[PDB]
Amino acid sequence: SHMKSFFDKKRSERISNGGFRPAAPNLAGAVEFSDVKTLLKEWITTISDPMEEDILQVVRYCTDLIEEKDLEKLDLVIKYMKRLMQQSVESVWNMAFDFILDNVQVVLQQTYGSTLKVT
Amino acid sequence: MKSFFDKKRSERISNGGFRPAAPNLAGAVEFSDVKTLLKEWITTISDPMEEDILQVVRYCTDLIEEKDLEKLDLVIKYMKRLMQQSVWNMAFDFILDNVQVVLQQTYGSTLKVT
């Protein structure tokens, strides 16, 4: 973990699971969409310059949702980030959303490479 | 004369069975039960009714709205191999085309069906 990572700090404020990797898709230990939504809003509204490692933790959470076949939650999370990041007055948040979406769509397309043809 | 799937649904209601919460075709939820129903429909009816074709389109669209891509692909491919083995060939193309339009407009992708 890193001192300056928003999501590492949030995970350390939650009660510790013992220090083990969770199997469940999670963002800083949060699993319920209501808890994930709260963390995402706090991140985007309190951090004006998001850290690379935090952006990658969001990508990894989304790719974990894909691997869990939880596309319903993936859609909710992507739409919520789209709303908050694309409306930001900070250009870096729009760039972060583009990066997250691009990486998630590559993972989705490859995971379903035998099923889906991207137009 | 009555829709094949309407008869199934009405028979279910007379036995105390109402719509499942999960996407379903006339009450069938698990792929094993959906297969059995689709096979009965396609093998016993030589001239499928529009009303039944549209209930299958609606079931597939319910799967899309639920993001159940795995089950949508299974159902589309199962129908393909029963309906192409005539008007059933046209019915399959009609069902698939409706699904592909919804997928393209919602997500920018379509089924490969390979």
Ligand SMILES: CC(C)CC(=O)c1c(Nc2ccc(Cl)cc2Cl)[nH]c2c(Cl)ccc([N+](=O)[O-])c2c1=O
């Ligand atoms: C590039 C990618 C392969 C294009 C696509 O196809 C996408 C997709 N497809 C899909 C899902 C369920 C079913 Cl039933 C059928 C289909 Cl086609 N689902 C998403 C969801 Cl659920 C959330 C977020 C995104 N996202 O990242 O924008 C997508 C997405 O792109």
